[PDB]
């Protein structure tokens, strides 16, 4: 009921429009009962007395009734369809907007396919609480109220007998509805699981094909697919088990009121005709009572899916400090003060990391595999927060500078290159959308990107494939380098930016890159120690600790761990 209250809150901006829907459906309900009444009247007024002179008049009244009933149904459906889709749109919007606020850590640990299921499959599942579901509820509650007042108008004594069977109908609804939500929430979570497999397997199908894992992934899929078929059948059975079960309950009541009615007739209270009439009036009460009870079983499918939607909507999102400052006139004074960090929060990754970088200095970060180089960078980007220590940009703490201004001043060329399924121009325009075509073409020329871009079928307007894989790995890195330089950041980070770029091309760029890097603070992570030897400062990391620091020639004559790394190259 807690999730229902929250879900029904999405209807609050549509209150006035929902009142109209109720006003129209009540008129549709009073016309829906006036129609067989008029059919019954015409037989008794024009057919029985055989005076067909009145027939065209009654036919015209009955015709206007049908014309009004059909027009009201259309009016109800039309306004409700747009009303329901505005709610579904808001729920989808709220989901996507939430993910943009939610921390990076979530996306890495949770399967992407499951999130995709929650946005489409789960939000499309809350449609069975909207549209015609609201109309049938509104139509049910009016007819139920209409019949119950007509029952007591016939016989008060027998009305209590028909009302005494209601707690049994509510009880069996409560048993079935609880089981419906049980297997339907389970169906939706196994669906997200299956969606996670399909998504991950397609994105890396090459690796599955290369290692002949096609069969092993099929049997991996078959485990979740069989689980989905098993729980789906249970949820489907419980969804429609209530209507034939209620017809059995109605028959128990019909026999009960026949017994009670027969008893009252023998007590000289009513007649045999009254029993035959009350069974007719009970039918116009049982119909909405069974319909509303079945609707309660049907809304459990939306209620279970709503939980999965709300689960995403209540995740502790990335928030800025209440008194957070914006970095004005950036210079590039990067500093780390006894910084400690761990991802699992058990085994430490970074241990007492303390160093200072003055503005404009081209600093090199070097060390072994899994030293903590990328970790230092992700902490400077504030993707994760320090366990104990301080990161100071331009003399202000990272937690005190707003995430907007920090990421505006700092640019990054990530270890794993991520591109988009659009034109080369748009991929380079990302970060700085207010960059002229001349600026883009000049930057691409500087990083030796322009050469292969011109060779493409449409040039800069060539729409790239998913993650821009229609290019060589090195060519993808060159585009990422261009995109970062176009963003024009005062602090630039080049984490393994030329892993797949050949030493010949790397030498050609380094010369032109220096001109468009002077007056900018930079952190260069590289295992090609020979390229970063010209740096103003070389930070040597090992097992999450700064073992050595200083210039190349100073560290070489020291015959330390930097020397051990440099000599290992040949």
């Amino acid at each position, epitope marked *: 009921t807690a999730t229902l209250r929250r879900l029904l809150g999405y209807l609050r901006p549509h209150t006035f429009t929902l009142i109209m829907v109720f006003v129209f459906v009540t008129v549709s309900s009073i016309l829906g009962v006036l129609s067989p009444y008029l059919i019954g009247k015409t037989i008794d007024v024009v057919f029985v007395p055989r005076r067909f002179d009145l027939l065209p008049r009654y036919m015209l009244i009955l015709g206007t009734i049908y014309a009004l009933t059909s027009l009201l149904f259309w009016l109800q459906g039309k306004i409700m369809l747009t009303l329901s889709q505005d709610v579904v749109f808001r729920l989808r919007k709220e989901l996507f907007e939430k993910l943009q606020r939610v921390p990076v850590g979530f996306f890495d640990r949770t399967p992407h396919g499951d999130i995709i299921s929650r946005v489409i499959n789960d939000v499309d599942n809350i449609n069975n609480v909207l549209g015609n579901s609201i109309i049938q509820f509104f139509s049910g509650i009016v007819t139920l109220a209409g019949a119950v007042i007509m029952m007591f108008r016939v016989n008060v004594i027998l009305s209590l007998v028909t009302l005494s069977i209601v707690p049994l109908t509510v009880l069996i609804t409560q048993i079935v509805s609880s089981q419906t939500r049980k297997y339907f929430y389970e169906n939706q979570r196994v669906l997200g699981q299956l969606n996670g497999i399909i998504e991950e397997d397609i994105s890396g199908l090459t690796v599955i094909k290369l290692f002949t894992r096609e069969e092993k992934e099929m049997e991996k899929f078959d485990r979740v697919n069989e689980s989905l078929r098993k729980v789906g059948t249970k949820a489907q059975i419980f969804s429609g088990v209530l209507p034939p079960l209620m017809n059995m309950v109605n028959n128990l009541g019909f026999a009960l009121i026949s017994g009670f009615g027969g008893w009252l007739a023998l007590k000289d209270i009513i*007649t045999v005709g009254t029993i035959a009439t009350f069974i007719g009036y009970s039918r116009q009460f049982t119909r909405p009572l069974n319909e509303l009870s079945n609707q309660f079983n049907m809304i459990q499918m939306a209620l279970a899916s709503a939980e999965r939607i709300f689960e995403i909507l209540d995740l502790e999102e990335e928030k800025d400090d209440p008194d957070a400052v914006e970095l004005r006139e950036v210079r590039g004074e990067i500093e780390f003060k006894n910084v400690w960090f761990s991802y699992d929060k058990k085994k430490p990754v970074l241990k007492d990391i303390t160093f200072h970088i003055k503005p404009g200095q081209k600093v090199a970060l070097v060390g072994p595999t899994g030293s903590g180089k990328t970790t230092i960078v992700n902490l400077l980007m504030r993707f994760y927060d320090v366990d104990r220590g301080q990161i100071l940009v331009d003399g202000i703490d990272i937690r005190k500078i707003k995430r907007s201004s920090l990421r505006s001043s700092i640019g990054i060329v990530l270890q794993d290159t991520i591109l988009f399924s659009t034109t080369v121009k748009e991929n380079l325009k990302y970060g700085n959308p207010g960059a002229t075509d001349e600026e883009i073409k000049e930057a691409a020329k500087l990083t030796h990107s322009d050469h292969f871009i011109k060779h493409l079928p449409e040039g800069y307007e060539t729409v790239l494939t998913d993650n821009g894989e229609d290019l060589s790995q090195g060519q993808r890195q060159l585009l990422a380098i261009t995109r970062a330089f176009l963003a024009n950041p005062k602090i630039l980070i080049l984490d393994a930016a030329t892993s797949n770029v050949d030493t010949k091309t790397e030498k050609s760029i380094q010369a032109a890159m220096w001109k468009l890097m002077e007056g900018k603070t930079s952190i260069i992570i590289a295992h090609r120690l020979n390229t970063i030897k010209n740096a103003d400062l070389i930070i040597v990391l090992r097992d999450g600790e700064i073992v050595e620091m200083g210039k190349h020639d100073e560290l070489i004559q020291k015959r330390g761990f930097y020397y051990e790394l440099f000599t290992s190259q040949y």
Partner: nanobody
Amino acid sequence: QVQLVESGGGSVQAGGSLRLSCAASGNIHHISYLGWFRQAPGKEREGVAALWTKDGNTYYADSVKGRFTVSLDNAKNTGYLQMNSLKPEDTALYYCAAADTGSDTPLWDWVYWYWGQGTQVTVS
């Protein structure tokens, strides 16, 4: 203390007519139901004719229809059933049943019910 006496049952040939009397004696307040039922040598209970004194509507068996007519005398306190154009198929033991409603009956607890003696009606 109410008792019902049954009289007027004899051998009548096919197509004939015979009237059946059902005299009721006791502290009768108001009769709400009057019924007649036939029982064959090896059968439990059936339904031939019924009278509801509140409206006067008479409900007869499917085979009877326009043959038997059930009536009740208020002053004489005697129930009647007129049998006309009798066919040999309805050769059975005929019984009487009456429902009485007394002054101030409890909210849920019902009043009384009374049965007849039984007289054989033979038709060939």
